[PDB]
């Protein structure tokens, strides 16, 4: 279905889906890509991190393991 697929601090890998959405509820952050279907995926292995920039929207980042 749609919705968030990862939790704060969860370890992920390249290609890994992070969020499914018809729109841009969540914006691509550092190390995060976005297909045409608005899906958000990890560009590298790391840790999922959510951040709310308020007016700028809700972004999703991936912090490289090392």
């Amino acid at each position: 279905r749609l919705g968030v697929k990862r939790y704060e601090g969860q370890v992920v890998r390249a290609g890994n889906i992070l969020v499914r959405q018809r729109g841009t509820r969540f914006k691509p952050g550092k190390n995060v890509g976005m297909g045409r279907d608005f899906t958000l995926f990890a560009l590298v292995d790391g840790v999922v991190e959510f951040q709310d920039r308020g007016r700028l929207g809700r972004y999703v980042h991936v912090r490289p393991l090392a």
Copy 2:
């Protein structure tokens, strides 16, 4: 480590961890996701709500933010 990470009525945002468990000690409720490691996380922003259903399991819900 393992254990509940939120309290009754706490205010959580999408992706926040609610419970870290080895098994299905707590069940995913409304607006609550669960990873392969059985981690329960908030699918949307809201209020944490614990519901004991007895033998039917103990649910963890996320009531849509007001």
Copy 3:
């Protein structure tokens, strides 16, 4: 007719029928396949185990033995 066909912890063999359902009353878990008729069967030889994932559904698994 329809209904659960095995009990918790029952030892079963590959091919064995586990549950006969019209829909996804139960979902196939580890080592459990699901036919077109939604019938759940053991993919391997092992012990039957039931698991409730709440908002995510109730699964049926087969724990290999030895």
Copy 4:
């Protein structure tokens, strides 16, 4: 992918895949054929039946419909 595809007593048609295996995890029983890719399949229309001969191996048979 790999794995047993039918459940005990399931009705299959001629040419239906019964099992997918890399080796001879299961031997071709009555009315059952095996492709070069060890894939078992029903030679006729009938009912799937598993037979565990232990040390002799494991055969998959298809009992003629009628």
